[PDB]
C-alpha cells in the first residue's frame, strides 16, 4: 500500500470529498474513510492558522498550487522527522489548494483535481514512502492509529 496507485487513490478520494463529488464506484476504502475525517479536521485548522497567508495569494493555476504545496511541505518536513500527523497535513493542504483553485483558477478544467492528486502522491511516495512501509503502511499503521478505539 506504499506504491503510487494506492496513494494516488487516497489523494483522489480526498479531493473528491472536498469537492463534494464522491465516486459512485465501489466507495472509498476503510483507509480513505478514516483519512477523510482526520484530514478534514486538520484542513479547517490550517485554513484558520494560514488565513493571512492564503488571503495574500491567488491560486491562479496548478503551477501556483504546486509552488505553495512545496513551500509548506518543505518546511513541514525540513527537520527530517516523519510522523502520521505530518502526513495527514499533506492531504489537508491539497484540500485547501483544490478549494482555492476552484474559485481562483484562470482556466477551469474538470480534471484539475487529478493533477493536484498526482503531485501530492508523487511527494508522499518520494519523501515518505519508505517511512510509511516500515511503520505498517496505511492499513496497519495509519488506520490502527486513527480509527475509533
Ligand atoms: C504564509 C506566507 C505567505 O504569506 N505566503 C504568500 C506567498 C507564499 C506564502 C504562502 C504559503 C502557503 C500558503 C499561502 C501562502
Curated annotation (Swiss-Prot):
Seems to be restricted to the hematopoietic compartment. Expressed in peripheral blood, spleen, and bone marrow, at moderate levels in lung, small intestine and testis, at a minimal levels in other tissues. Also found in vascular smooth muscle cells and hematopoietic malignancies. InterPro entries: Bcl-2-like_sf, Bcl-2_BH1-3, Bcl-2_fam, Bcl2-like, Bcl2_BH1_motif_CS, Bcl2_BH2_motif_CS, Bcl2A1. Induction: By phorbol ester and inflammatory cytokines, such as TNF or IL1B/interleukin-1 beta, but not by growth factors. It is found in: Cytoplasm. One of its GO terms (biological process) is release of cytochrome c from mitochondria. A motif (BH1) lies at residues 75-95. A motif (BH2) lies at residues 130-145. SUPFAM superfamilies: Bcl-2 inhibitors of programmed cell death (SSF56854). Gene3D superfamilies: Blc2-like. PROSITE patterns: BCL2_FAMILY, BH1, BH2. Keywords: Apoptosis, Cytoplasm. Pfam families: Bcl-2. One of its GO terms (molecular function) is channel activity. One of its GO terms (cellular component) is cytosol. PANTHER family: BCL-2 RELATED, BCL-2-RELATED PROTEIN A1. Interacts directly with BAK1, BID, BMF and BBC3. Interacts directly with BCL2L11/BIM. Interacts with BAX isoform Sigma. Interacts directly with PMAIP1. Interacts with RTL10/BOP. Interacts with ING4. Interacts with UBQLN4. Belongs to the Bcl-2 family. Retards apoptosis induced by IL-3 deprivation. May function in the response of hemopoietic cells to external signals and in maintaining endothelial survival during infection. Can inhibit apoptosis induced by serum starvation in the mammary epithelial cell line HC11. This is Bcl-2-related protein A1. It comes from Homo sapiens (Human).
Amino acid at each position: 500500500d506504499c506504491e503510487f496507485g494506492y496513494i494516488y487513490r487516497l489523494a483522489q478520494d480526498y479531493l473528491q470529498c472536498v469537492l463534494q463529488i464522491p465516486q459512485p464506484g465501489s466507495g472509498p476504502s476503510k483507509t480513505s474513510r478514516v483519512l477523510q475525517n482526520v484530514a478534514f479536521s486538520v484542513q479547517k485548522e490550517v485554513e484558520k492558522n494560514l488565513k493571512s497567508c492564503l488571503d495574500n495569494v491567488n491560486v491562479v493555476s496548478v503551477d501556483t498550487a504546486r509552488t505553495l504545496f512545496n513551500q509548506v511541505m518543505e518546511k513541514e518536513f525540513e527537520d527530517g522527522i516523519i510522523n502520521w500527523g505530518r502526513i495527514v497535513t499533506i492531504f489537508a493542504f491539497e484540500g485547501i489548494l483544490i478549494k482555492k483553485l476552484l474559485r481562483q483558477q484562470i482556466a477551469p478544467d474538470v480534471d484539475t483535481y487529478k493533477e493536484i492528486s498526482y503531485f501530492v502522491a508523487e511527494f508522499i511516495m518520494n519523501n515518505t514512502g519508505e517511512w510509511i512501509r516500515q511503520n505498517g503502511g496505511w492499513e496497519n499503521g495509519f488506520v490502527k492509529k486513527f480509527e475509533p478505539k
